[PDB]
Amino acid sequence: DSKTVLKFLITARERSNRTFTVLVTEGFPNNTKNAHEFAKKLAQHNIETLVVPDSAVFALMSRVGKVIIGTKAVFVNGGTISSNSGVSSVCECAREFRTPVFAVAGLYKLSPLYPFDVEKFVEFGGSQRILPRMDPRKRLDTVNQITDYVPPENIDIYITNVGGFNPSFIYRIAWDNYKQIDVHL
Amino acid sequence: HPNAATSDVNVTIDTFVAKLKRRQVQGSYAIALETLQLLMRFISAARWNHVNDLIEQIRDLGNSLEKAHPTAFSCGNVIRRILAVLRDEVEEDTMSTTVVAEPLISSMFNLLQKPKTDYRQVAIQGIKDLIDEIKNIDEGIQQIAIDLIHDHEILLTPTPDSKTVLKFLITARERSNRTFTVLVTEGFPNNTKNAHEFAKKLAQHNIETLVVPDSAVFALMSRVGKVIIGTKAVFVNGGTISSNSGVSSVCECAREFRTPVFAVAGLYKLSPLYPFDVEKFVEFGGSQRILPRMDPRKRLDTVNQITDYVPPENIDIYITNVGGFNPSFIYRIAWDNYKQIDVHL
Amino acid sequence: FNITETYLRFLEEDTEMTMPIAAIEALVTLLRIKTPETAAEMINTIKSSTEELIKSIPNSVSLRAGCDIFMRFVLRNLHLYGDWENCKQHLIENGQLFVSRAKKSRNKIAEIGVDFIADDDIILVHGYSRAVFSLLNHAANKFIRFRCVVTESRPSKQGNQLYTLLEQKGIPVTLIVDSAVGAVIDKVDKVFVGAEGVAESGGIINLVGTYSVGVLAHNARKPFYVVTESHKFVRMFPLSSDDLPMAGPPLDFTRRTDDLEDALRGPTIDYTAQEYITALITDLGVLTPSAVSEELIKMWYD
Amino acid sequence: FNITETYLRFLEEDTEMTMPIAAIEALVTLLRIKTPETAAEMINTIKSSTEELIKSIPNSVSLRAGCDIFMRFVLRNLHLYGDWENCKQHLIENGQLFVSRAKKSRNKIAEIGVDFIADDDIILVHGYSRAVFSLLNHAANKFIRFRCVVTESRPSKQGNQLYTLLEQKGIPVTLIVDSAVGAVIDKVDKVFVGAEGVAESGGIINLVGTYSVGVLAHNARKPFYVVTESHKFVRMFPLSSDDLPMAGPPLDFTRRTDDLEDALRGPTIDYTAQEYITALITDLGVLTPSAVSEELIKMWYD
Fold first, then answer.
1. Is-contact C284 B92, C-beta < 8 A?
2. Which D residues, 180 through 199, put their C-beta within 8 Å of a C-beta on chain C?
């Protein structure tokens, strides 16, 4: 989604001798248009595009080399909240099949607040962009969320302006610019 | 039971023993062939009158053979198969002599309740059948085999010692539209030369060979796709004895990486007894092949082994001349070739 | 002609023949009263008796398994389709015959099962099954280097009892609490567990803990074992991670207390999956791959 | 004057001030008698006393941790390069002050860091620490629909004691057996821990069965947590999966004895690895990932 991640990709692609193929999940609820835009941008530069359904990751993961994210919020024990849709299951898959997980990060984007429960930090989504008409909604129950949370059990590096850091270590980085007093304001 | 009866009636027992002990006999196939020939000789000559007594004699012979050499499993297996062949015919005969119901082909409940003919030719024919089976495994495998591996994928290959494995690889490599990259581990104090030979053959075959030091498996595992064991023997709870060195560690690695492990073998290689130990079965090499010197080498007590055992857990499929089986299922295949009382001689 | 009374018979005595054997004998005795000829009179009565037994049953499924096995055997019996007397006689014979069989099975075990002992390999025995104890006691006759490890079991002080039976033959031991058994990863070479029930997938019903042990074994790659004779077979497969018929409690978050009355509530009996076990111990030759399911198929055909 | 005597003094009562704090107080009391101006007459004597205490230990760990912390504090104190009197006075003040601090730390723990049980996330707890209980009792006044699960404690029935402390708040509870620990990992949300110390390696120095629990948690991916007041970072390294500074024997294979005597030397202390703390709750901010080690480095400047 971001202008940062795209730029990072572009810089890599400039050295076109370095061989890399891009699989892009559409991201069902909100990411779709954005994903398409990203794909278009890739095409503009001459970067090889592969458009992915979100159900189909188990069928791809064993062939996937390296995985890069462009998150919104970075946390205490290592995990992240990423800009919407299809990240938890992906991460689980990676863990199962043992896959390297890159993440583009910034310390100002990094938060020193600890996430303790799913019951709070995970932000939910609108059913408006699922199914038109509201008379079937009387009996059924549509469940959807926009932005999703990641457990640190999966991701491995945070490529910053400072450097790539370990998730079970990034707290120190945060503290090298934040405190224990400025937490519960 | 000694060789007291078997003298000017049958001679080649001693020769067989000699071949076993000093290793002039080489490769399981050859051993099996030898055993078949022995059996043929037994049949064309020995004197019967009865049937149960003959069976007992055969059992005793088998026992003696086992006592002479254990690591030769093929020999045992073939004998067992021929016993099974005889047994069914005997059972059939008994039914006519006397002059039955079962839900399937065999029964547990038929073991609880109280239960001259031309069998010799049938016995003869059994041996022929066995020979034929031995003749070609590969020509019943490459239809379940040139199926599993695909384009731009990567193979990992330990044990280039079973002649079957190489053939299987080469049949796959034949196709002009299929492509794969091959990583080959060495296996040092028991397999190096063989591995080198295999590599050479691969090179000849016009395919992308990769020579690997036994250490450097971990620096390449990210790209790895498949695992192939070059086994020599197969057992009860699924598992296999292998044609020496450098298979176990790699299998373990694969398991850790959850990267699929396949087994290519045969049902003459298939055995009807449990490997309760590795110790009683798997044998050790020669400490001389590692290092020179002798008087400082009473101190240098070095350990090196030929054969390798792998637990049932790491391996997942056993594609045969019959077809694809599993470690959970292979037991029944064994039973389909050797009968219930033939397990213990 | 009563079965509950017979069941209550063997309790403090035992120490001779397998429990499921006595029950089977009782069943056979019941059978040879109401005539195996008249199928309308007999089978219904047998079913009623089984139901009664079930009603009287606390924490078991093995008796049920036994009686269904017996029924199956009976069904198999009449497949000679001739005279209605010989078959009946055979049926009559086959109850004390079952009892007799156990001995022979044990004998068979004590020769093929003693092929397994490796040089300096420490053994741990789980549960209370006669067969495992017999095998362990039969391995000391050949003077084979080994060792035994006890675990602190809690149904009716079982672990203590077990450790009290190993001191009779004079065998050095140490005691391990069910909580503490986590640290046991290398020193005990082989993890043995005795089975009070084996069904379709080679899954096992025993006592106060098996599944956890299995899990631990899987974690360490140490081999896990199922040890018995041959009578504990049902047509069963569980739904969740663990499921059984229960006269005891399945997780009671017990009501407000201050003086102690009722709280001893949780999974008393535990099941284990197929993948955890590497070797199966029966008198049925040597089988463990898939002889259970196949056996069941052979038996029931349904 | 003795620290041992002071330690003896509190036993029946207690259940309020952290042990490591009482010990510190005792040390301070011992100090402020025999002139703390000089460093020759004092530090060495303190060290000797600590050694004596260590020698005299029956089965207690955290004392050493406390004393080293105290030493570190003392070292920190005389870097201001002013005068001997003021600094000494400050040091003297800082014993009772330290004790006072513990309560504040506890308060901080129980009002900020208690948001780990909120949506009736059922708690599987083992290891009796004061902090854990304090947080649970403080969360009972908020009525956030909390539920407790208790794995049985058997060094000598601390479990009973524990269940008696949860009866004063009026909350449904259940007894759990650590053999059926594989059985129930389903409805219970997470596994929470009290302990005896946190290592230089990272993992936890604990009690009668913990490693198994950790393993099971790992298997199930239902996270494993440790909760305490923060001052148990002892200079100790459990390099193996069956080694620590232990009070009792490490699995003592007792000889072939007779009438049920030598057995109950069941491991009352166990440990699990560094890749097991999903979070660690400490009063110096909620910090975990490599926090203990960092703190140690800061202390020893290495």
1. no
2. 180-187
Sheet containing B317-319: give its strands across. Answer: B209-212, B180-185, B153-157, B226-229, B261-264, B317-319, B324-325
Q: Give the nearest partner residue to D174 out of C178, C213, C251, using CB atoms.
A: C251
Phi-psi region of B302 (alpha: psi -120 to 50; beta: other; left: phi over 0): beta
B185, B274: one domain: yes
Helices B28-45/B120-135 angle, 10° precision: 160
Resolution expressed in Å: 10.4
- For residue D67, the Cα-to-chain-centroid distance in whole angstroms is 14
Instruction: Check: CB of residue B257 under 8 Å from CB of residue B221.
Output: yes
Q: How many angstroms away from the CA of A125 is the closest CA of chain D?
A: 21
Q: Does B180 lie in the same domain as B226?
A: yes
Q: What is the CATH number of the domain that holds A127?
A: 3.40.50.10470
Q: Taking the CB of residue A62, how many other CB atoms lie within 10 A of it?
A: 14
Spatial distance between the Cα atoms of C277 and C301, rounded to a whole number of angstroms: 26
In whole angstroms, give the CA distance from residue B277 to residue C279: 12
Closest in A117, A171, A183 to D289, CB measured: A171
In angstroms, what separates the C-alpha of A102 from chain B's closest C-alpha?
Answer: 15
The answer to whether position A185 is within a domain reads: no
* Residue B205 sits in the same domain as residue B88: no
Query: Per the domain annotation, does B174 fall within a domain?
Result: yes
Residues of chain C found within 8 Å of residue D175, distances taken between Cβ atoms:
263-266
Chain B residues with CB under 8 Å of A21 CB are none
Task: Please report the residues numbered 234 through 293 in chain D whose beta carbons come closer than 8 angstroms to any beta carbon of chain A.
Answer: 278-279, 284-291
For this PDB entry, the determination method is cryo-EM
Tokens standing for residue D134: 């304090």
Is B251 a domain residue? yes
Its sign, for the CA torsion D134, D136, D139, D140, is negative
A97 touches chain B (CB under 8 A): yes
Distance between CA B75 and CA B79 in Å, rounded? 6
Who contacts C40 (Cβ-Cβ below 8 Å, separation ≥6)?
none
Structural domains of chain B, count? 2
Assess contact for B177 and B248: CB atoms under 8 A. Answer: no
Rg (CA), chain B: 23
Residue B87 and residue B128 in contact, taking contact as beta carbons nearer than 8 Å: no
Establish if D158 touches chain A: CB-CB under 8 angstroms: no
| A171 and B CB contact within 8 Å | no
- Nearest-Cα distance to chain B for A24, in Å, is 21
- Subunit contact A96:B222, Cβ cutoff 8 A: no
- Which residues form the domain of B266? 137-336
Q: CB contacts < 8 Å between A and D, how many? A: 39
CA distance B199 to chain C (A): 34
Which domain-ending residue is among B135, B154, B172?
B135
Whether A181 is covered by a domain: the verdict is: no
Tokens 């567990």, residue?
C193
- B258 vs A97: CB contact, 8 Å cut-off? yes
